[PDB]
Every structure is written in structure tokens, then in C-alpha cells.
Design a protein around this ligand. Structure first.
Ligand SMILES: Cc1cc(N2CC[C@@](C#N)(C3(C)CC3)C2=O)cc(C(=O)NCc2cc(F)cc(-c3cnn(C)c3)c2)n1
Ligand SMILES: Cc1cc(N2CC[C@@](C#N)(C3(C)CC3)C2=O)cc(C(=O)NCc2cc(F)cc(-c3cnn(C)c3)c2)n1
Ligand SMILES: O=C(C[C@H]1NCCC[C@@H]1O)Cn1cnc2cc(Br)c(Cl)cc2c1=O
Ligand SMILES: O=C(C[C@H]1NCCC[C@@H]1O)Cn1cnc2cc(Br)c(Cl)cc2c1=O
Ligand SMILES: [Br-]
Ligand SMILES: [Br-]
Ligand SMILES: [Br-]
Ligand SMILES: [Br-]
Ligand SMILES: [Br-]
Ligand SMILES: [Br-]
Ligand SMILES: [F-]
Ligand SMILES: [F-]
Ligand SMILES: [F-]
Lengths: 476, 479
């Protein structure tokens, strides 16, 4: 009902509910993840988990509770039954304070390193602001990896390998283009040394959003938690640590990237159902001819590793089913009616473009595989083009507000001084308000891919010598 | 180092710490599950997840919090309550899930409208919290634990019951086929079944060293009781509203504890090959620079060859540990097979292989390695299971009268006794056995009413009440 570009947030809420991905919940900021969405989480989880296992990272499970003093918008447990606890305990917002004392105990010698752990769990961040399903929620599923190394070089190497896996999670599984970069000093994880990130862009509201993160923590947590090892010469040294995480936010980004006015569009690589078979039957009927052929076609397609679901539910019209599965975002629908039975073909409609194909039964499995690769690729390339058109390369501050009013990001030469970022946030916030009467812009990332910087280029805000091209915009 | 048959509890503590399975934590009743334990969990999780997906069960994720009014729709002391965010008190307190019925079933009532929506079959892998102020046991009884909970809804009772039994058979396979732990299928007594369910089925395990039974997993026929409570109804094909027939089932990381206690020995863990992330560890014997490069090369060749046979191999080529250290390390961790390669073996074209369960050593040519190791692993798996099954059979005494109860309990055995199944008699038996044990609770309770029933001769009396016995019932002290 709501059009994606006209009323984006209403479009989003409608799409995630009518698709049967999300059920809203009486406790604000928490959502039920139904199988249509949870299957996508399972797919990217399997991909990422298989890859980090190749790197020697091992899964674990640490408690969801942390004691008050060890933690020093956290949800506090204070009672069991009607009886108060001796001390109140917090639900994890992240697990540094839960894991790193164990790391201190475990690590004694250089022979104990590197230590590489991951866990899949949920965390709780009880912010009072209004939630956004998938993107900003009070409880969410994630994975957090935490490693420790004998040298800075090895930790940094892992940071970048994990960031590349996050690029693949988004770009290869979810067909979402992302930008690799480094966070500004004011936006990085405090208590880390350097934060790398992959950033995505939502064209409909012009907002950047952080997609995943990979931190070079350095030795600051080692000194805080006394994580030391004896080296090959017998001297005590601090470990060099990393941590990295990615959440069900990724599903939200996928939904927003590929959806259209009709509803969701799910990339074939992660879709719970890749091909829905719709028999063209009407109430009663059922002689078995058409459903028999559908079952044959399902078996044949499943032998080619295609995920297939026959919607043989009675008392829905074929058009009702077409719209139902389009709203859910199934990438291909296969229609089988009497005419198709009589000619030995089936009619296949791809979700992203609406293009229809008449395919002989014998040709179904290869053709569908081909179409699937094409849909996946096309979804990514169109989204990549939109990303490129949403970034304006500028040189002076007078170009900022116009570009933000076109719902674009800006790539601008920046001095990288931390005070200027706050200034810029405030100054853009003010200018925005003033227009509004008739909203702040921050750094998203300093991209790894740096265009050339002509000698003597000035920072777009301060006029001081610019160091690097920086990506700015409004953000989630 | 404690011996398993002398101080069982300290043996267990040392076994799970020394093998790097658990780490202690400052919040009582919670433990850290280290990677070595988590590998076994991942194996049984993958097994069970694949099998329920073949049945059409889909995974999902429901919130960890539930509202007061939803939680108490109809145990209360065991629920952890969240009352504050930062320093602000919530308007109303919210609870952490001890189980998810009150969270999922309102959603079921909304989602189910027509027979076209059935069956609805969902599962989730998560953790739950039961805040008992009693002493925990690592894996077996903890305040937070990992589990899966499945919840299904069906148009008919017959279909629901078939699913209950199919899931219970998957739990039998989880314990017996993966973990090599024998279990007994049965039905819970009226006093021990899930309240507000119709029939609870169970698989039960036994710990010989302390004589205790323990529930291994559970599968409930809920019937229509929760459908009434939550108004989960469907319009059948003639437009009449009908109640759904429901099931719920679960199993936890307690399974790992049971595996440890069943197969572990004085040397530490013993991991069944089917759940071992490392089935064969290859130890290069490096000493005085004798043939270092050729030995390492041959180890890598053997690893490739074994992996083509789908054997899970690790080469422990770490230079900062001696070979003898590595032998002990992987023995304490329970790796089923150790492969030793030194210059003597390199010359002979053979390897020395030692199996963890018995310590027997084999000299195996390289060309024979893969089929011989596959044979040895199936032998180890089967032998672990069979020896545990024999201990289970020897731990059960079939009795007729109440006077044989306390002697059998003092032999650390369970009893199989003819029982009237009256629920008051179970409470009376619990209290009386506890009293007699005084002269870790000594009470004896029902473990299950086994599916496999011995003959019941006409006129057999209940071992306690003397009324006519209905069925043979398995009783013991328990976890
Ligand atoms: C799912 C998810 C995901 C993320 N992030 C953060 C970065 C990250 C990435 N990359 C991680 C964690 C991986 C590193 C990611 O995914 C953050 C939140 C969140 O901050 N939740 C609390 C909350 C609740 C709420 F009702 C409202 C707000 C709210 C409203 N306005 N503002 C400004 C906040 C916030 N949640
Ligand atoms: C891991 C786990 C597992 C199980 N169960 C229950 C049945 C089940 C099976 N099969 C499930 C859940 C699958 C159906 C299973 O695995 C129960 C508990 C537990 O009751 N935890 C709380 C607690 C903490 C604690 F510190 C101490 C005690 C305690 C000490 N003495 N007594 C009498 C209690 C209890 N924990
Ligand atoms: O959570 C982090 C840092 C990193 N932890 C490991 C996974 C990847 C992740 O980026 C930063 N962070 C974010 N939000 C937080 C919210 C609260 Br509440 C607390 Cl106490 C602490 C934190 C906190 O430390
Ligand atoms: O948890 C159950 C019933 C079933 N739920 C689904 C998975 C399998 C499981 O056996 C029984 N049970 C057990 N312990 C509980 C503890 C508390 Br606290 C509460 Cl409120 C409720 C319960 C409670 O309902
Ligand atoms: Br994938
Ligand atoms: Br974060
Ligand atoms: Br027909
Ligand atoms: Br004991
Ligand atoms: Br899984
Ligand atoms: Br339970
Ligand atoms: F150092
Ligand atoms: F596995
Ligand atoms: F290896």
C-alpha cells in the first residue's frame, strides 16, 4: 500500500509484517523473527561461521549475566521470584567484561597465542529511543569475535581478514554493496586503537548505516585486564587484541536495499524458497493432474539443489498467491495451469523485473539456475549503481547542505582533527533546523580506497591542510 | 588427581577443567563453555537440526523477555526479574525466559486461522534461565543453559502424538547414536509430567558412580489444553472452529555432562568418534633434528589421505611442546585416536596408532591407514556404547516388594517395580525413602514408566500399596 519512495518508514513496517518476517511484540523494541527471516540469518551465519573456522576461530558460550562491579542503558536483574538478589546483575550489552578476565587466566606464555574465540548469541541494549525493526532494536542476535595475538601486525592482519569476510557476507550473500573504511577518532570504539567498518547507504532517506565492524584493540584491554604473556626470551608482554561483530541489522539492510513498491525482493542465495510453484486451480477441482505435475517438477528441481515450495493451499485464487509470494520476495514463481500441462511447459516470472519465460519442463532446472545467478548479480549491480549515485564528491562546505538535501552522502577532503567533526555536526544540525522551521551530519568512514589528493588541498571545513577523503552524511 | 570410582564429584570437576571444557565464573550457577566443549555441542546440534528440518520444522527466534501479565497467564520463585534500565525503574517488571510457552503461544493464536495453516512446526536454539538457589552441577544443573525448544500445532491428536514419538526417537539417537549414551524411553508419572500437558514422554539416563537417574530429554503431548488457554483455534474444511493439538520438546547441554560422566575414566575425557571434532591427532616425533622436514611432510600427506576418507584430522606440529606433552594433552582431552610418526616409522612406511578408550596400539602401513582407522573408530563408538549399556543393565534391579527398595538403593541401583500409578503413593514413597536414607537428597522418585514393559502376571500387587499393579515403573534417586 505505502510506496517505498513516498513514505519509506511506513513502507518498511508494512513490508516486514506482510512478508511474515517479523511479528511485533508487546515489549517495545523486541521482535519475533519468523522463519521467513530467520532462514536468511541461518544462511549468513553458516557462511560466516564456516569462514572463521577456516581461520582457526572456535565458538564458545559465555554467560549472559555480568556482575555490577565487573561491568564497571543496561538491563538490570534485581530479583528472582519475589526475593531480591544480594547484588544486581546486568544482561550483556557486549561481552568484553565477561570474556577478558578469562583470557587473562588462560594466557600465560607465548605458546598460548594466538587465542581466537567467537560466540553467537543475543545482546540487550535498552535505549529509550524509538526502535527500528532489524536496524536498531533493544534485543538483537549477533556474533562477537574476540582474539589475542603476540604482535600488532598479526592482530591487524586478522582485523582485515574479518572485515573482508563482512564484505562477502553483505555483497556475496545479501547482494548489498558496502564501503570499507576506518572510523574517525570520535566515532571509533573508545578503548580500541583503530576501528574498521563496512558502511551501507539507504537512498530513500539518504542515510548511511554501519553494516559490520572490526576493531584493532591494541594493548589497552590487555593492560586493563592484565592479559600478559611471557615471550620466547622470558619477558612479560601485553597481548594485542581484536574484536569484531555483525548483527541481524544485515537483514534490515538487505530488505531496504532490494525492496520495491510491491514488497520484498530476496536474493536467491539467501531466500528460504527460491522457486514457488503455483498451481492454477480453483476451489474444489483437484483431479490430481496439475498437482501431480507440480510434485514431479518439485522433485526434479530439488535434485538441482533448488529450494522449492508448492503453494497448494485450497480456497485462494492464483492471483492471490502471486501477490502473496511477491510480497514475501520469492525470486522466482513457476505457474502451472491446464494450458501449460497441455503444451509441456511452465511459465516462470522473476520477481526483480517481472519478466516472464516459457520454459520446457526438461529445460527447467538449468534455466532456473541461470536465472537465479542473473537475479543475484542484477540485484547487486543495481544497488551498486545506486550507491555510486548517492555519493557526491565535494571540496568546500558550501556544498554540504545542498548535497544533504538531495539525500546524498558527501566525500570531502578532511583535516581529520576531532574537534572539527563535532563542529561540523553542530553546524549542520543548526543549518538543518533553520531550514526545517520554514539532522546532524557526521563521518561515516574514511574509505580504504582513497582518490588522489592534489598537493595543498584544503580541508573542506577548516581550511587547513587536508589529510584524507572522508565520507560524511546523515546516519542511523 | 581423583579416581572416578573413589571421589566422583572431584573426578568430574578435574575432568572438565583439565580437558578445557569449562571455566568458572563469579556468578554462581553459571559457567563458561570453552571451545573444546562447544565442539561437541555443535556436533549434536547439527545432527538434531538436520533431522528436524527433514520433518518440516523451521527455526525462529522469539524474545528473551516476557511481560508479567503474559508470564502469569494462569515455579514463580525461579524466574529472574528485570526491574530497571540504567537507574530508571521499568513501569512494570519483565522476566527472562525460563521456557517460551507464554511468549510463543499468543503468536500461535494469531497466526493459526485455517486448517491451511497446519501443521505449524517451529524450533529455536537459545538459552534460558532458571534461578534456583541450590548448588549447581556443571552441565547437569545450571542457572543458565543452552537448549533447543520445539513447539508444534496440529489439526488432530493422532498427528501430534506421532510427532511426539518421532522427536523422542531423535533424542534417543542424540544420546545413543551420537554420544554413545544408553537411554530408556518412557512416560512420566502424573506427578512428574509437565503440568498442563496431557502426556510427557522422556528418555532417561543413569549415572552408576552415584546411582542417580537423570532425565536426558523430553517430548510432551500437550493436547488441546494450551489451545484452550491461549485460544489457538482453526476453521476446519466445513467452517467449524476446532482447537489445535500441540507438542513441545527440548534438550540441553546437560547431554554433554552425561556423555562426560558415562565415558570418562581416570585419564580424563573420552569422546565418542561421532562427536569428536578431532578424531585423529597426528603427533610428529621431533627429537635432535632427526629427519624433521621429511617427518612433517609425511604427516601432511597422511592428513590429506585421511581427509579424503572424511576422517577429521589435526596435526599437532606445535614446536613449543614435546611429543610426550602432546600425548598427555590429547589423551586428557579425549581424542579417540593418536597417530605417532617418527624416523623409525618413516623408515618402515608405517605409523603407530593408539586408541583412547582401551590404550591398545597398532602398527599400520600407510596404505592401510584410512580403512583401518575407519574400522577402529566404529569399534570405539560401538564399544563405548555397549560397555555403558551393560553398566545400565547392571544398575537396575527388578523387585516386587517395598522391602527390597532400600537395599537396592544402597547398592546405588535403580529399581523396576510393579506400581498402581496412584499419584499420592509417589509422594508417600518419596517421603518414606528420604526418611530411611537419613537414618543431595536421598528421596526415591519415579524416573519413567518404560515403553518396553515386561510381562505383568495377573494379580501382581503394587510394590508399595498392595493394590493391583498397573505397570512396571523405573524408580531411583535422581538429579
Ligand atoms: C540491531 C542493532 C544493531 C546495532 N549496531 C550498532 C553497530 C553494529 C554494527 N555494524 C554492531 C553492534 C555490530 C557492531 C550494529 O549492528 C545497534 C543497535 C542498537 O543501538 N540498539 C539499541 C537501540 C534500541 C532502540 F529501541 C532504539 C535505538 C536508537 C534510536 N535512535 N538511535 C540513535 C538509537 C537503539 N541495534
Ligand atoms: C542444565 C539444566 C538442565 C535441566 N533440565 C531439566 C529437564 C531437561 C531435560 N531432560 C530439559 C530442560 C530439556 C527438558 C533438562 O536438561 C534443568 C536444569 C535446572 O534445573 N537448572 C536450575 C538449577 C540451577 C542450579 F544451580 C541448581 C539446581 C538444582 C540443584 N539441586 N536441584 C534439585 C536443582 C537447579 N539445568
Ligand atoms: O560493543 C562494543 C564493542 C565491540 N564488542 C565486541 C563485538 C563488536 C563490538 O563493536 C561497543 N559497545 C557498544 N555499546 C555498548 C553499550 C553498553 Br549499555 C555498554 Cl555497557 C557497552 C557498550 C560497548 O562496549
Ligand atoms: O519448560 C517446561 C516445558 C517445556 N517447554 C518447552 C521445551 C521443553 C520443556 O520441557 C516446563 N517448565 C520447567 N521449568 C519452569 C520453570 C519456571 Br521459573 C517457569 Cl515459570 C516455568 C517452567 C516450565 O514451564
Ligand atoms: Br549464501
Ligand atoms: Br557496537
Ligand atoms: Br482440475
Ligand atoms: Br556425586
Ligand atoms: Br543451527
Ligand atoms: Br523442563
Ligand atoms: F608489551
Ligand atoms: F558439526
Ligand atoms: F592440522
Amino acid at each position: 500500500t505505502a510506496k517505498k519512495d513516498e513514505n519509506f518508514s511506513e513502507w518498511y513496517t508494512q513490508a516486514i509484517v506482510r512478508s511474515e518476517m517479523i511479528e511485533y511484540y508487546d515489549i517495545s523494541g523486541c521482535y519475533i523473527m519468523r522463519p521467513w527471516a530467520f532462514h536468511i540469518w541461518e544462511k549468513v551465519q553458516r557462511f560466516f561461521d564456516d569462514e572463521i573456522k577456516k581461520m582457526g576461530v572456535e565458538n564458545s558460550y559465555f554467560p549472559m549475566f555480568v556482575s555490577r562491579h565487573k561491568l564497571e542503558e543496561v538491563a538490570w536483574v534485581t530479583h528472582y521470584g519475589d526475593s531480591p538478589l544480594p547484588e544486581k546483575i546486568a544482561i550483556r550489552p557486549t561481552s568484553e567484561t565477561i570474556m577478558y578476565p578469562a583470557y587473562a587466566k588462560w594466557i600465560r606464555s607465548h605458546r598460548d597465542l594466538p587465542l581466537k574465540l567467537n560466540q553467537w548469541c543475543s545482546v540487550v541494549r535498552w535505549e529509550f529511543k524509538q526502535p527500528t525493526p532489524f536496524l536498531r532494536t533493544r534485543e538483537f542476535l549477533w556474533q562477537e569475535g574476540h582474539t589475542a595475538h603476540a604482535t600488532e601486525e598479526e592482530a591487524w592482519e586478522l582485523v582485515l581478514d574479518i572485515l573482508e569476510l563482512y564484505r562477502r557476507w553483505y555483497e556475496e550473500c545479501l547482494a548489498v554493496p558496502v564501503i570499507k573504511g576506518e572510523k574517525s577518532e570520535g566515532e571509533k570504539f573508545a578503548g580500541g586503537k583503530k576501528t574498521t567498518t563496512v558502511e551501507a547507504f539507504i537512498p530513500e532517506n539518504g542515510r548511511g548505516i554501519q553494516a559490520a565492524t572490526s576493531h584493532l584493540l591494541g594493548t589497552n584491554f590487555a593492560k586493563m585486564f592484565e592479559i600478559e604473556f611471557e615471550d620466547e626470551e622470558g619477558h612479560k608482554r601485553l597481548v594485542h587484541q581484536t574484536s569484531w561483530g555483525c548483527t541481524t541489522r544485515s537483514l534490515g539492510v538487505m530488505i531496504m536495499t532490494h525492496g520495491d513498491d510491491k514488497g520484498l525482493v530476496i536474493p536467491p542465495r539467501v531466500a528460504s524458497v527460491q522457486v514457488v510453484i503455483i498451481p492454477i486451480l480453483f476451489k474444489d477441482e483437484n483431479t490430481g493432474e496439475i498437482l501431480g505435475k507440480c510434485r514431479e517438477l518439485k522433485t526434479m528441481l530439488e535434485k538441482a539443489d533448488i529450494r522449492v515450495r508448492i503453494d497448494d493451499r485450497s480456497n485462494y485464487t492464483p492471483g492471490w498467491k502471486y501477490n502473496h509470494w511477491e510480497v514475501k520476495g520469492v525470486p522466482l514463481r513457476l505457474e502451472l495451469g491446464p494450458k501449460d500441462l497441455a503444451k509441456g511447459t511452465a511459465r516462470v516470472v522473476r520477481r526483480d523485473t517481472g519478466e516472464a519465460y516459457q520454459i520446457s519442463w526438461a529445460d527447467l532446472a538449468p534455466k532456473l539456475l541461470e536465472l537465479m545467478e542473473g537475479i543475484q548479480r542484477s540485484l547487486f549491480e543495481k544497488a551498486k549503481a545506486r550507491l555510486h549515485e548517492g555519493i557526491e564528491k565535494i571540496s568546500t562546505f558550501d556544498e554540504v547542505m545542498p548535497a544533504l538535501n538531495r539525500k546524498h552522502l558527501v566525500l570531502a577532503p578532511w583535516c581529520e582533527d576531532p574537534e572539527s567533526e563535532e563542529q561540523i555536526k553542530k553546524e549542520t544540525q543548526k543549518l538543518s533546523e533553520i531550514q526545517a522551521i520554514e539532522g546532524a551530519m557526521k563521518t561515516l568512514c574514511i574509505p580504504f580506497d582513497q582518490p588522489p589528493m592534489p598537493e595543498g588541498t584544503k580541508c573542506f571545513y577548516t581550511g587547513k591542510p587536508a589529510k584524507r577523503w572522508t565520507l560524511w552524511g546523515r546516519s542511523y
